[PDB]
Amino acid sequence: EVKNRLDYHISVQNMMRQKEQEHMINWVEKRVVQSISAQQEKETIAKCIADLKLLSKK
Amino acid sequence: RKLALKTIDWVAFGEIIPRNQKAVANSLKSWNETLTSRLATLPEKPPAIDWAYYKANVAKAGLVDDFEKKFNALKVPIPEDKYTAQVDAEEKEDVKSCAEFLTQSKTRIQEYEKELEKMRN
Numbered sequence A: 001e002v003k004n005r006l007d008y009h010i011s012v013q014n015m016m017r018q019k020e021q022e023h024m025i026n027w028v029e030k031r032v033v034q035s036i037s038a039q040q041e042k043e044t045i046a047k048c049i050a051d052l053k054l055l056s057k058k
Numbered sequence B: 001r002k003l004a005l006k007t008i009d010w011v012a013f014g015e016i017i018p019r020n021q022k023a024v025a026n027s028l029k030s031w032n033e034t035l036t037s038r039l040a041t042l043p044e045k046p047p048a049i050d051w052a053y054y055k056a057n058v059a060k061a062g063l064v065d066d067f068e069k070k071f072n073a074l075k076v077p078i079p080e081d082k083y084t085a086q087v088d089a090e091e092k093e094d095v096k097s098c099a100e101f102l103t104q105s106k107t108r109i110q111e112y113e114k115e116l117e118k119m120r121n
Helices: A002-031 A044-054 B010-016 B019-041 B051-056 B063-073 B086-119
Strands: none
């Protein structure tokens, strides 16, 4: 009779963490993704590494 | 409490049926079995509880701590006799069987044996 009450409190905190997590995630990721490419060099910094692919993969 | 542990001889019991307790016997088998086979299966305790680790992961806190202390400090009730005069009601009816009935009966029985001797002879 005790256990079921406990599982609810734990279960709610889990469920709420995900229900924030996706919405927080979408809200963050939709915010900062809007920037970024103004630094084209998020693009270059990889052409850098992508070149360290183009070299260092073969 | 416990369990009565005791012995059942089924052709003995069932046949006995002194009218004022007879009925019980026929029913009494079936009643007993219910308890017998059931209890054999179940466990007597459940799991146990690590309140600390669960508590740390709860967010409505201090409640689990309340319940925890109260549970560990707590004792549940017990269940108790309506009847331990039945225990004794036996020895009285056992007086009935033996002394009262035994003796007068015994005397008759013996005599017939000796009687039979001579009436074989």
